[model samples]
Target: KVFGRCELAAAMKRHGLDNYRGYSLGNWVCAAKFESNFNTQATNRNTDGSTDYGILQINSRWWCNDGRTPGSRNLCNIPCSALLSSDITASVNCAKKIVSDGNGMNAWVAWRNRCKGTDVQAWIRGCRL
Candidate 1:
């Protein structure tokens, strides 16, 4: 599913992403935009041979088990296919795990590069939440 900007914002808010772990909902919205453009089925293969999946692009090397990443931690304890679902429940939960890993949102390069220290409110502007 390719969500509209405000649609994605509202969805994230509904899933309790607002102010999660000191990160604003806008930060998540912004990060998802840069990571996967709101596409639930988005996937990207990294140079290290791991793959990123879902809107937030959680990595298989550390988060999900794709049966291809050697010694993958699978910290989220879910199949990589779970992240590609349109429901996004698994994806969001895995995202929470990533942030809770002591690195905060910095675990995501997209968040670090595009959302960190920026006014992300525009990402959710005019979205009723």
Candidate 2:
């Protein structure tokens, strides 16, 4: 589903994602902004032959299978297509797994490229977290 940044933050907070896997709400929200602009259906075909899935843009190479890519690990163990749905529960659960797998948000390149050193405070400005 489409979500505004603020509402997304609220939802994340409600879901206890604001500060899990040991980070701030800003990082989570910022990554979502860059990853998919809160578009749950967002997907991108990468030059490396993997697809990115969902709002957090989980990767098919290590996370889920799109059925086109052979030998996909499906690490999150859910259909890649499920991540594209509007409900977001599957996406969030998978994201939690991605981070808690001792990886943090590094899997989301957007977090490192955009959210990491930016004024996370500004990114989370007005968020009720």
Candidate 3:
């Protein structure tokens, strides 16, 4: 499922990511915008041969086991496929693990390059949540 800005924002908010850690809802929104454009089924292969999966583009190397990523730790203890579901609950939960594991929002290069230090409020503008 491909979600629009506000729809994605509201869905993320429902999953308790509004102010998770020091990152605001807009930060998450901005990151997702660049990561996968809110497309749950999105996937991108990295140069290392490991793939990034789903809306937030969690990598297979450390977070989820994709079977193809060499030396995958599966720290989130889930199959990479779970991140691509339209429900987004698994992705959100895994994202929380990524942040809580000392990686913070910086775990996502998209977040660092696009969302970090920006006026992210614009990303969630007009959202009722």
Candidate 4:
């Protein structure tokens, strides 16, 4: 299910991100696609037989050291699974903070720059999310 707009707005405010010009949503979807194909439940297994947890594919050991489950914390607190939880807005806002301290959409722009050398730009431009 898509995250509710109001909830997302609240999360953005909590994280010091602006919900203007659809920037938050756009950035969220872009990061989700980049990080985990937008799958909230996605995970990755390491060669050591351990697992990285959740949608943002946060490395559980590093990001989820707290007592709660890997999916139970904000990105600011956990820095990983926050995006994978039901709170897409929180995840995106957290990512925005991490990207450039809330400056000009540097994360998205950086992704676009990386796409310049490959055919990824065409796909990125056409992405509806």
Candidate 5:
């Protein structure tokens, strides 16, 4: 199921992580906004011959196997299907894992390409922190 942006922001606030690895909350949200448009079930094929899974669009090359790709890093140690849940507990945790890998939010290209320099506070507006 797809989540509304405000709901997405609230979910992110809980587990999506703000200021993770020196990056801001908006950074993560902005990236997620673009990656999957906050759609939990979103998936896409990468030119690198790997698949991206879930709302964060975690890569199959490193994250999880989606049948199309095998022997993934699965760094989050989760089944790729878990990342597609509206709950997103595993998904958020995996995203944290990607961030903790020392790449920060750069783990997602959407962050670097679109959300990096923008004022993302609007992303969480009216959420009351």
Candidate 6:
């Protein structure tokens, strides 16, 4: 699905990110592209047959234990997903909180390091989030 720019901006705003004029949006989109190819419905099968679902590849089991039952059920149960259904930006923000200690763009950089080898500029240009 296509998450419009306005929808993406709204998602960012909910996270206190009002300024998307810098490289932050670019970085976030870059990470999303790398992680899930911007596919909000993406899912990964766990070793135990459980699954990580949605754009950020959030582990449903972990999220359920964390009290996000909706996410655990692949229903976009968390606040992030509740902001916008199946939106990659929402999941990216969730991943940011989980991975970057609340620093959104910083988490994207960390993701970049793990999934490197792609040209930064090229990836940024290709990401339309």
In terms of lDDT, the best-performing candidate is: 3
Task: Estimate the TM-score of every prediction.
Answer: 0.96, 0.92, 0.96, 0.42, 0.90, 0.49
- What is the per-residue lDDT of model 4 for residues 29-92, given as tens digits with 9 covering 90 to 100? 3444555555666667666444554434544443343343434433456544454676555444
TM-score, predicted candidate 6 vs. hidden true structure: 0.49
**Models, CA RMSD each:** 0.8, 1.3, 0.8, 7.5, 1.6, 6.4
Model 3 TM-score, 2 decimals: 0.96
lDDT per residue as tens, model 3, 1-129: 999999999999999999899788999999999999889999999999999999999999899998998777898899999999989999999999999988799889999998899999999999898
Better of 1 and 4 by lDDT: 1
Give lDDT: candidate 6, residue 90.
Answer: 54
Which lDDT values do the candidates have, in the order given?
0.91, 0.85, 0.93, 0.47, 0.80, 0.49
Off by over 4 Å in 4: 1-31, 48-51, 66-75, 79-82, 100-116, 119-129
Candidate 5 steric clashes: 0
Model 5 Cα lDDT, one tens digit per residue, 26-110: 7777888899988889988878778888889988888776666756576777778888997978788888778888777777788
For model 6 the local lDDT of residue 24 reads 47
| Separate clash counts for every candidate | 0, 1, 0, 0, 0, 0
> Which has the higher TM-score value, candidate number 1 or candidate number 5?
1
- Poorest lDDT segment (10 consecutive residues) of candidate 2: 120-129
Candidate 6: stretches off by over 4 Å: 2-23, 64-90, 101-114, 126-129
Per-residue CA lDDT of model 2 for 1-129, tens digit only, reads 889888888877777887797788888888999999999999999987899988899998888878877776888888899999877788888998899877688878889988887788677686666
Looking at model 5, residue 27 earns an lDDT score of 76
